Amino acid sequence: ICLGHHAVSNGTKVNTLTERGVEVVNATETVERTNIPRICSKGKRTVDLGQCGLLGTITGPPQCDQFLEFSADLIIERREGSDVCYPGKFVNEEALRQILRESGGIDKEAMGFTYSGIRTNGATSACRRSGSSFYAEMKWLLSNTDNAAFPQMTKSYKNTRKSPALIVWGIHHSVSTAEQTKLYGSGNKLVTVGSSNYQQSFVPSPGARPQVNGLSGRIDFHWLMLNPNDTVTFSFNGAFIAPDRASFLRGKSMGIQSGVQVDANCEGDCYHSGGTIISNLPFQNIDSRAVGKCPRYVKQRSLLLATGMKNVPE
Amino acid sequence: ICLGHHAVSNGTKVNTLTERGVEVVNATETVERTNIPRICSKGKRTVDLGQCGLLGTITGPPQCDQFLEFSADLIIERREGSDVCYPGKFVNEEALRQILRESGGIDKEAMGFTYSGIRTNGATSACRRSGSSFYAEMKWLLSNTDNAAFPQMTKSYKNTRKSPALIVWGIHHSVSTAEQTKLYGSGNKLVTVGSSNYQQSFVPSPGARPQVNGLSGRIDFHWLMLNPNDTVTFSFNGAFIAPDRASFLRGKSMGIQSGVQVDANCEGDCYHSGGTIISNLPFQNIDSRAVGKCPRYVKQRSLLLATGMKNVPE
Amino acid sequence: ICLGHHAVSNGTKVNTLTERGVEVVNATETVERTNIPRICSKGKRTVDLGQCGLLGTITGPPQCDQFLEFSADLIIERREGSDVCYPGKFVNEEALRQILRESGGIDKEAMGFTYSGIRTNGATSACRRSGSSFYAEMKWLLSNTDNAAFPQMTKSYKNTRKSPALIVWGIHHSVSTAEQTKLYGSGNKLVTVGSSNYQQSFVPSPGARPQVNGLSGRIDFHWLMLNPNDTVTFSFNGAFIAPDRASFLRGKSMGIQSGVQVDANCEGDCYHSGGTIISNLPFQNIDSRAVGKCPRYVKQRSLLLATGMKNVPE
Amino acid sequence: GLFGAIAGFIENGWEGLIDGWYGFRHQNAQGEGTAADYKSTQSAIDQITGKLNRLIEKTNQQFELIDNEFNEVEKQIGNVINWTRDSITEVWSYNAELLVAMENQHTIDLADSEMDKLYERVKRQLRENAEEDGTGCFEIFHKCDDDCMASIRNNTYDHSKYREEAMQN
Amino acid sequence: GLFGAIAGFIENGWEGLIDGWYGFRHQNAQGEGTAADYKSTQSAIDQITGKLNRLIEKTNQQFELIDNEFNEVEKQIGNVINWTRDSITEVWSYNAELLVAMENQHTIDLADSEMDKLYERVKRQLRENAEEDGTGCFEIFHKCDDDCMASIRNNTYDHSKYREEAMQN
Amino acid sequence: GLFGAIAGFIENGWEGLIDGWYGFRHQNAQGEGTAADYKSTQSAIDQITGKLNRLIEKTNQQFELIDNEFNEVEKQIGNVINWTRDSITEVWSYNAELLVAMENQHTIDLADSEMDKLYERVKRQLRENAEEDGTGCFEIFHKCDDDCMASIRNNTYDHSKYREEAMQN
């Protein structure tokens, strides 16, 4: 009586501790190369920001009007998105983005500032609604008449909630030192801000910038997180963009950046710009910046795991 | 003659490369779960800062009076600790904390600034000693009379030591632009500072802040490290909190944050907020932010290592 | 007939999973300890900056005159190097260094600023060429006469290239508030700067600093990267050091810091301050901050790999 | 192979044993035969299967962006990030390659191991009633009929009731 | 098991062998016996012990805080830190799980290995004076008395001085 | 050793076998002999060589400075950097030590394995014409001359043409 093992005409080559390209009976892949070029979002509350930039949801340019109080498990940023209508930017912007990406969405709350002896309805052709408008959640505070002085004002807001309040204000940098005076009067304009946690202050910087949206003025956007029962004071004398509403975070979410479509027919937890990595495999060679719950990124294109014995044909 | 191996009625289940929950004769744990809820400090010079905040040891609020020149292998910060008596904070605070945590303690040295034509004895009800006082290592420089001007002064300090000198100064931000003048006179107040390594400058920011300790004024605290034989210049015209003494680091230590008690009856090198991880095991599932000399943190609660053969009962 | 295996009088001890210091027939090292104390640069376009500091290649102190437009695969910084002739430093300096280290060198381009109603030929004894000079790529803009006013100027530069332009300007901080006026007139001096990407502004800070190079004045150096077809505006009124030429990156390189000599007789890709690690071994115990293409740094001095069977002598 | 069989004193495998991994082939009077041992083939299959289920593995560890692909973060923090990311990639590429090689080596050896277990167990069924050919075949000194074959395969062959006959021979 | 014994052509273990890991059990005239081989039991114990001392291991690498639990560091640097920390945790959780599995597999196989060494060495003490039962028992064809048993155990049994007698049988 | 030979029922090695790793030593009439098996010695050498070429390995992953040795970067970012770097060092020091230990264990066992393959193959060349001494030597019951030795070594020794003679004895 004779015994033996099976074999095949064509084996699969694998690598071992000692040998390179030994043929085994059967093998199976261990590195995922297959991408699905869509954002598989089946079962998830998804918000596709489109033209609305993430940071814009807090301030309110027209493109963000339908996103002022969104709610999501999954937040998608798009290259076409913009945080701004009137030219400007956020100081410490990416920190804020990371916060908003996992906020699970936002909830808005009037801070209840009232004004006495100034203007309040600043607008621009960059923010198009009716006609000229402004940031929905903000207020452009002027001086009552086409020149004037600005009264050193002091507003305060207490966070009456059990969660930290996202406070955002703005600083306006006019084209000229002339323009600055036509809006808030002459002089050195000062904005000071404090909490039980925060210590800072701001002065404007009038001067000509490149024309963006048609304008050479800019707006500095600044932000801080007010802890429960802590209070924020705004000491200022012009060039000030005031928060109307404060923001509160809803819970928990994931934020990605993508150029592909949403698909509610496929499910996945591993996302990158080009789509979704659906896989059971422990590794992937698709995108090292993939986020969510992913197989480990590796450099190798392929790593075959032996699922059978050495293949020995006659 | 027959041979065999031993076995038991109850085995311990382990995991292998191929099999999950195979019973072996004996096994032993590999992940530490047992915490000792004390700071095991046997044999170590320990400083428990209590109500004194780490950064306060450099400036000197009353709660830090017994810590101005401490010496330690192990430094413990406590949630109740405060860096401050008069409301304010440190610019670049956490960097400084990390420095002080491994300084092995500090040593103080008079910088020998003398003053001509100003006041020098500023105080407050926030800093309680005799009655109203101030930061022990600092000096609140005023204008001679309840209004006045401030003479543009220039002090310098040379580090005559073989180790870098920790220099700390302060900027005062008054409640009003009125108050700023009552302390240092009217005008734009400027503080400039330089070394062979350092280039910066500071202007105050008067305005109302929230009331902390009873006060709506703040103090900015700033710091730099003066290398041996390098020199620091202070050009200023008011709103200035001057260093009296400079600090020098003693050697080497470890700093932790904890809410548990010190115990000089147990020894350990792996610390976290909840106590001490005493273990020989290579891994731990207690606290991923554990510091000192620790087994690796892992996610698994348990990983049994086989210390015997397969258990086969009849 | 009898069979057996070979053995030797003296074996090499190795470590196994179960046993420590078992003797095998032959073994081979796995950790590299051997350093070659030179920068093995065979086959590579090398630039040894010597006394020229990396950042100086952009601005142009005399020691950098032969490096204004260098081209390299390998850039060597030297401890003796300096970025500066007139005392000052770069804001955000190390970021810029990292950029320049892998730029593959730089290429300069006139930005074509013209001036009307000011001076332009500022110099100093710190920048020695003919006699007193300045930074080659920069221009020290004054006020026409030994006092005067400075006209609020507005220059702009558009990046007409397919690559980002490295823009550098300077802010001058004079010894006195008197000196500031003698150079640019009295008043608050403002510099504002913007792109499609950038929002900032600057005010000087006159005051006495320590004497460096003989001088107590400093120069702030600032920089930004202008994307293709994007435009940069400079709004200013004095205390301004203007860029003459903009810089463009050539391609790709590696930058190191070393105190050893260049040697074009040896080749290597793994570099550290003390030389070159030439090795096939997977690990090294020489320098954990080694850069380039290196075996992994490990703590162990030695790890012997068995290349033979257990050694059993009679 | 670590156990000397499967390339091996057994010089090759059978591209016809499509019924299992390990098997018996017999030459006797009544013609010719070839079957498959299930218990051996199964133990190996179940061991390889165990590896599979262990490696096809899901992390429940979520990671978020610390980077920005539309608007680049500041260079310094950017370079630390990439430096870190690349370092971790090196570690995982290393882990992955080693894991797979280590596993393939062991997979192969246990496949070799299972063969040797089968052989060395049949050999023990046929005490002195047979002797070793050395190519994995057993010379029978009492001409087992097909029923005597299945007696070996199904592990019931008698350890003495062909003996002194086969011992004579 | 990688070596075919210990579950095994040996079908199970003895919950009575409290004296060691491996042992001899004999049936003869003078009653019944069961002992323990020390040299086998010890070699295995010393090998397992070696693993233990190698893994129960101390780092001399100190780590400090880069984080703050009383006063949170800035968000961006905070997120990089956590991202890094979590990445390293993934690597160590992976290393730990693999290490232990790899080790348990080998521990088991070397335990199986030691049994086979014992057996296959006794078998060599008893050349033709005995034959293999196949369950790890040896059929003696010359009725070893208890002294002849201890001759095997203590590794002194004679390789020819029971021979032709046991060969007759 | 995992395969029981090489320290071993073979009690030691030969410091004279400078010709190879594994070999034959024979005592007969015509004097004394000692040779080397190439095919065994080669298979082991080629396996060890395979490990070498696999570990002596080049990364194509370039790393740049994120640190400054002439002008220290800011403390906070500095501490994160060092913290990260030290963490990665821990991982690589760990990987390196484990890799080498794991490999040395296996190197040794496969060396033990190859010996057992050689032996257990010669044993199969000499069916009943010889029996096992137990120290790795084979007692020949038909006095092989030197030509009969080289018949075994070169793997051509006859499996029956010394038989009944050696069987008589």
Ligand SMILES: CC(=O)N[C@H]1[C@H]([C@H](O)[C@H](O)CO)O[C@@](OC[C@H]2O[C@@H](O)[C@H](O)[C@@H](O)[C@H]2O)(C(=O)O)C[C@@H]1O
């Ligand atoms: C509240 C307010 O003052 N809104 C103005 C706005 C501001 O003055 C300005 O944005 C601040 O810097 O200016 C706007 O008109 C400016 C517009 O003027 C044209 O003459 C010019 O050709 C354009 O380039 C552009 O600057 C605006 O619409 O935003 C007007 C607005 O009412």
Ligand SMILES: CC(=O)N[C@H]1[C@H]([C@H](O)[C@H](O)CO)O[C@@](OC[C@H]2O[C@@H](O)[C@H](O)[C@@H](O)[C@H]2O)(C(=O)O)C[C@@H]1O
């Ligand atoms: C050196 C000095 O000026 N000390 C003052 C201090 C400073 O003026 C102040 O802290 C700077 O902003 O003010 C203190 O009294 C202030 C105290 O006044 C009460 O009228 C008021 O009701 C309180 O809320 C509080 O502001 C102080 O004690 O610190 C007085 C101090 O002498």
Ligand SMILES: CC(=O)N[C@H]1[C@H]([C@H](O)[C@H](O)CO)O[C@@](OC[C@H]2O[C@@H](O)[C@H](O)[C@@H](O)[C@H]2O)(C(=O)O)C[C@@H]1O
């Ligand atoms: C463009 C210009 O003004 N160049 C001056 C320069 C500047 O005024 C100065 O650097 C700005 O702060 O000053 C220099 O001379 C200064 C020189 O004066 C001696 O009297 C003094 O003893 C020295 O310490 C030193 O300050 C200079 O050479 O840089 C002159 C220069 O022409």
Ligand SMILES: *[C@@H]1O[C@H](CO)[C@@H](O)[C@H](O)[C@H]1NC(C)=O
């Ligand atoms: C080859 O391997 C894969 C592993 O998943 C398996 O599904 C398949 O059954 C195997 N093919 C054969 C012919 O056994």
Ligand SMILES: *[C@@H]1O[C@H](CO)[C@@H](O)[C@H](O)[C@H]1NC(C)=O
């Ligand atoms: C805030 O104030 C309310 C009312 O006094 C109180 O119920 C709540 O506990 C406070 N929150 C904190 C944490 O200060």
Ligand SMILES: *[C@@H]1O[C@H](CO)[C@@H](O)[C@H](O)[C@H]1NC(C)=O
């Ligand atoms: C079980 O394992 C541990 C390992 O440390 C050991 O101390 C103990 O002796 C073992 N128990 C028995 C019954 O051997």
Ligand SMILES: *[C@@H]1O[C@H](CO)[C@@H](O)[C@H](O)[C@H]1NC(C)=O
């Ligand atoms: C500082 O000055 C003293 C006295 O000149 C000198 O001994 C010392 O070397 C100096 N230190 C350095 C490093 O400049």
Ligand SMILES: *[C@@H]1O[C@H](CO)[C@@H](O)[C@H](O)[C@H]1NC(C)=O
């Ligand atoms: C010892 O090991 C090294 C491994 O590179 C090898 O080059 C050398 O041939 C070996 N020496 C002997 C005596 O085989």
Ligand SMILES: *[C@@H]1O[C@H](CO)[C@@H](O)[C@H](O)[C@H]1NC(C)=O
């Ligand atoms: C810059 O302008 C030129 C000329 O209009 C054009 O060819 C080029 O595409 C522009 N580059 C970009 C990307 O704006």
Ligand SMILES: *[C@@H]1O[C@H](CO)[C@@H](O)[C@H](O)[C@H]1NC(C)=O
């Ligand atoms: C970081 O890595 C990405 C690719 O993963 C690369 O495109 C990018 O340029 C890197 N960051 C920096 C600072 O260049």
Ligand SMILES: *[C@@H]1O[C@H](CO)[C@@H](O)[C@H](O)[C@H]1NC(C)=O
């Ligand atoms: C970092 O991790 C800790 C727990 O380890 C978590 O509590 C904290 O929220 C994280 N940091 C940030 C930025 O939220």
Ligand SMILES: *[C@@H]1O[C@H](CO)[C@@H](O)[C@H](O)[C@H]1NC(C)=O
């Ligand atoms: C970082 O590590 C280096 C050595 O690798 C050490 O000299 C340096 O002091 C460390 N950085 C800091 C912040 O001290």
